Amino acid sequence: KCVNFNFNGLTGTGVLTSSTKKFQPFQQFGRDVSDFTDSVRDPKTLEILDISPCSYGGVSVITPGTNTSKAVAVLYQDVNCTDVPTMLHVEQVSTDWRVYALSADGNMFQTQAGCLVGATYENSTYECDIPIGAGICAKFGSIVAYTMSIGEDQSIAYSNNTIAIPTNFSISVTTEVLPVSMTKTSVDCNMYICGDSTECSNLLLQYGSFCTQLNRALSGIAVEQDRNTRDVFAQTKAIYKTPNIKDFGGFNFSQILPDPKKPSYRSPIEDLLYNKVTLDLICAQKFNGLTVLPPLLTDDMIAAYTAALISGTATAGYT
């Protein structure tokens, strides 16, 4: 049972069991490499006991989201489903927990990761949603566990006297997204640590350049972020005027080039991108010495670069 204990003044909390270890004639307790006591000699009965942490190995709770249901499943890591009622402490403390710790028909499923309780098993394959273990995932549609699929099955028969050749084709366009830069921050290392305390300030000066080093590291990052942007967009120095013609032999560029007759300096697609990733604490940050610095290049300048790159491609080679 999980319990508090005291042996000759040696206290702690844990589970006391029978040991198979041996002690020296005058040894009262044993400890492992972490100086954790795992064995004690009982002062009245000359018998060595074993001491275990009340809970150990890790437990995970699986949820579909509290805005969907209040159903959960519990994964007991690296245990069998026959030992759950023992690793738990069902008869000692658990109340509503008893329904998860105790087995029942269709209540427990044994996996490699551990024992999963509260979820059923589909006996089918699907794309992974919530990963649980190795090869096992689950979905809401209670909770359903299943083996994840790695793709559909295909079979190409081998032959040595035939060949397949396409008689038709299509043009497709795909989208790839890459991060280029971070938000540039700056910290006032005195305002953050001491604030208005002048006594603290005098004591903070006793830590040498530690404070200065922090400022230097952040400054270096801030500079790099402007280099990151420049090294991606500023590929050609020449800036090409966006043409009034968006029809280049039947090819329509009006969605990737900016429209000079509109209030906007960005293309239709770009405007859509901007409105999708846009997504007082600010006062608290400022008062405690935390601020944010603007980028060297404005959004209109970045747009100018992309417009030039496209305009100079639709009209010329060796760009």
Binding site: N161, T162, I163, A164, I165, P166, T167, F169, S170, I171, S172, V173, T175, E176, V177, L178, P179, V180, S181, M182, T183, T185, Y192, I193, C194, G195, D196, S197, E199, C200, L203, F210, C211, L214, A217, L218, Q225, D231, V232, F233, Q235, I256, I269, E270, L272, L273, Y274, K276, V277, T278, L279, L281, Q285, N288, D299, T306, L309, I310, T313, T319
Partner: protein, 206 residues
């Protein structure tokens, strides 16, 4: 696709959210006592004289300094990850947009033709235009054709039979040509080529 798929730009949203959290987390670490009687320096100074106040203050200074140090360290690690991404984006600008790539799955999923960049907050979006084959048919093939005891091989493409006659076509698009002495080259002694078949190679001078 973008309008109906909010997750399409999730990579850029993650950058924004990670930075916002780091700053808010840092501010909230000023409410910690770190073992001191108070999180507030003025309350310590108000109640205690230096012989005791310094102990309480040192606890706050050490913990606040460690919290700032952990913030800066994680920004340096993140900065390295972003720089690596920026370098990749720059490479793609040069090889996908300002030229045509021969690298598989570098500028799209099919055969690369051209790309166009688009601006975005904290990053760049590339539109990759690719050629994709479809509607494949199977033909009987052969490694070579034997004309007059001499083996003939295609300069490019493959030999295929349409069910009645043999032609030379390209692999990426079916467009059968007549087999002539101009579309093939003569090399080998016929009996040394496995799977060789007999046919007529047309001589344009006749």
């Amino acid at each position: 696709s973008l309008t109906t798929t909010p997750a399409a730009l999730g990579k850029l949203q993650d950058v924004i959210n990670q930075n916002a959290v780091a700053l808010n987390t840092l501010v909230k670490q000023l409410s910690s006592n770190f073992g001191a009687i108070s999180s507030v320096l003025n309350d310590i100074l108000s109640r205690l004289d230096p012989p005791e106040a310094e102990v309480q203050i040192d606890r706050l200074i050490t913990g606040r300094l460690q919290s700032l140090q952990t913030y800066v360290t994680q920004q340096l690690i993140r900065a390295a990850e972003i720089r690596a991404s920026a370098n990749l984006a720059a490479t793609k600008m040069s090889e996908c947009v300002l030229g045509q790539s021969k690298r598989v799955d570098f500028c799209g999923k099919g055969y690369h033709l051209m790309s166009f960049p688009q601006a975005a907050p904290h990053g760049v979006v590339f539109l990759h235009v690719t050629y994709v084959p479809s509607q494949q048919q199977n033909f009987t093939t052969a490694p070579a054709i034997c004309h007059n005891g001499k083996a003939y091989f295609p300069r490019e493409g493959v030999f295929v039979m349409n069910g009645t006659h043999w032609f030379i076509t390209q692999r990426n698009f079916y467009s059968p040509q007549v087999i002539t002495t101009d579309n093939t080259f003569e090399s080998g002694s016929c009996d040394v080529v496995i799977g060789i078949v007999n046919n007529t190679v047309y001589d344009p001078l006749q």
